[PDB]
Write a protein that binds this ligand. Sequence first.
Ligand SMILES: [Zn+2]
Ligand SMILES: [Zn+2]
Lengths: 98, 812
Amino acid sequence: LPPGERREITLETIGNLDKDLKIRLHLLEKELTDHKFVILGANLFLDDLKIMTALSKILQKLNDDPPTLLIWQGSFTSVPVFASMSSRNISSSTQFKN
Amino acid sequence: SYANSTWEVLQYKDSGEPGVLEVFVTINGKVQNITFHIPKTIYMKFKSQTMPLQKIKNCLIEKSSASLPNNPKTSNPESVFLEEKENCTSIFNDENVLGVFEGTITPHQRAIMDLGASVTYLSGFSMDIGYLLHFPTSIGYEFFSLFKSWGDTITILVLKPSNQAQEINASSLGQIYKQMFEKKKGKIETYSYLVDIKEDINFEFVYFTDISKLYRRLSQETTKLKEERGLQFLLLLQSPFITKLLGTIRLLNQMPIVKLSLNEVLLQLNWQPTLLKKLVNHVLSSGSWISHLIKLSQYSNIPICNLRLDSMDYIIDVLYARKLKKENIVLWWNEKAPLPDHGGIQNDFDLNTSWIMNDSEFPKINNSGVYDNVVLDVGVDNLTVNTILTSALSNDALNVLRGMLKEWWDEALKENSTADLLVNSLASWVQNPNAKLFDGLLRYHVHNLTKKALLQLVNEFSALGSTIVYADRNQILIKTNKYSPENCYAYSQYMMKAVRTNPMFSYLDLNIKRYWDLLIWMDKFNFSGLACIEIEEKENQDYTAVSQWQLKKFLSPIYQPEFEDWMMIILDSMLKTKQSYLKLNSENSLNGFSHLFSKPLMKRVKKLFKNQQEFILDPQYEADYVIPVLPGSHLNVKNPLLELVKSLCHVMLLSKSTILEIRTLRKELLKIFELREFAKVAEFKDPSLSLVVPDFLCEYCFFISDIDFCKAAPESIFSCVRCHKAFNQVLLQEHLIQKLRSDIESYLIQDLRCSRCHKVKRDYMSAHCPCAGAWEGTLPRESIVQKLNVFKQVAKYYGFDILLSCIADLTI
Ligand SMILES: [Zn+2]
Ligand SMILES: [Zn+2]
């Protein structure tokens, strides 16, 4: 497989593009502390009540320390949402919205 | 006393302890039932090294898994007792195809429903069933009922807002209720069985300031439920709004999932007229739903818990699963993903995957003309099931479905109406993505079969001395070449009998209808058919010319009456020349017609032009003279009166023989208003801009027909022609956006075509063709963008909030 190139190596080969600013930001970030990057995990489902309670407890835990990053993952709904010509008096898109 | 009957509800005992399900079976005595452990049905086709890799703890070899048709070639044509975590069992020392696959992954509760019949005479009890559910509310009345059939007290929570008395005393409502109860008694004695309904229901409205008190009242109602009866209690909850909530509130209670009418008549001080009808519907529907569930389960061997409120296509799923389980091949059903579950991927995407779902539209053949003898003909319906039956006169699944369809057709004749309903809804299930066991290949192949069916019908009509001037696959339009009189219409019936008898079909619609003694055929919405189906006396009982004129509507509201009046004048003139030609014989009639109406046409043209000379530049007139903005057309204004005469030319241009006389009239008109004898500006080039969803269906009517949003009348999109039921807006927007974006990804997945050689881009690294010409292409973005603009115009026309959101997203 074609060998890769380090981001720093790629940058130095292509030259400066958008050192003093980068090192200042690096020093500031090292000064920065406890910045939490929280990722819930793949396929969070809003339909399930047990998963809803688990996510509520997770939000309670995150309330103690608000993360500087939070990621919400794909497939928010449990089952695929799509057009329904045989509507059950309420569109699946409406449940997805709710 | 203990099971030995049908189970109304089948649900998991708990998230923990997988494989053990609770049973809500109502015994011939007092409900009560349970189920043991059921293994996780998942076939990996491999068993030799399965044991060392995982503890499957149940053996199955020699085609353990099922291969079912799909895009991957591998999936094209052993369940684990414990739900063990997967541990890379894809490796297969059996020399079979690598990969465990998930061709048959179903919940065991669904699987046991698939494996076993409903009964474990469905249930002929004299048992009473409770009838508490959410009563329909018009706007915000929050109507609800806590009613026990044995309790005799409606004990409604209806009119929950205490500020306003939404619920009426219902004393006069009660007496009208009873008098219709004897009026509707004939269905009542049938509904009086299986549940106490003949009893009069009192009215006791309860007002709740806070909804938590309402929840407490429901909890206390549940505390009554299964204690007032002690044992042997059934509940009927047909309210979709509270169907999900009550199941959580109720513990181990039994209730069917089927729904009653979603809402009642929107009437809130005068709620009595609609409360009365809603409660009548409720009491009749108790017994109606009970009997319908019983007979459908007898036909289906499925529990009442099976969902049919949206459609009985889930029953179609369970029956097809049972049928496949009989054969060596095993079902592809998958509740989790409504997409078909063939092999293990179930999610592979390629050109064929989009190919099968897209372009599922019925092709239409149109020949614009005016003819001596035109018949709109039978207008065959439900051509999908007819075609699939006539095909019997992948291949294994096709054969299984054909056998099931023949079985249902045998049931569809001289049997219960449930069999007929299931036959009608089988076509919808074949195309419904929401219904599981739905294959994109199956839908595409049924569409292609209908295409060949239309082709064979065209070929059969070709032999007859008649021409198919239009083809809709819902109504088929043919004119007869001969100028024969009334006796031909009886002869037309005889010949179309002879035509339909010849092939080996019997499912197409008979009773030729809506013959047109004269038709000026432009499209679906612009025509002048006369003397529809009758005793066929050839215009004696002349039905007035039905003429939608989606282009005439486009016109300026003041020029519209003039255009319509002149088309009646034109129609009368051609009719008179038609009797003249018929008497002469005892389109030459149209040829004489042309010279007949030439002088009035030209004289009125200039007259109108001369009037327009002063008519123009008038603020009162120009307000009327402005052409209404419609989604169909984008042509220039070009002196709307000139648009009128151009439209007249276009509607006249249909008659091939008179085209020379039409040219004479055009020369006369260009003498009337200065313009070159032949001109592109003189050419019409009318834009249609038809936005159509392929094979749209109405769930109540089950009819399959393409719906054209721009061209059809505003209520025509809303309400289908077959049944009075009106399409909901949300599904309309969903389907329109479906087609729009599906075309967008199609644009993203196209294959380039060369300039000189015109080959296809078999090369990913092309950078100009290996031919001298470059890769031209097929269908770029720009007119897709103008179609987006037409979508926006419709969005102004029709609220279409989902469409508005889609447009907003696409702009970004
Ligand atoms: Zn319909
Ligand atoms: Zn080339």
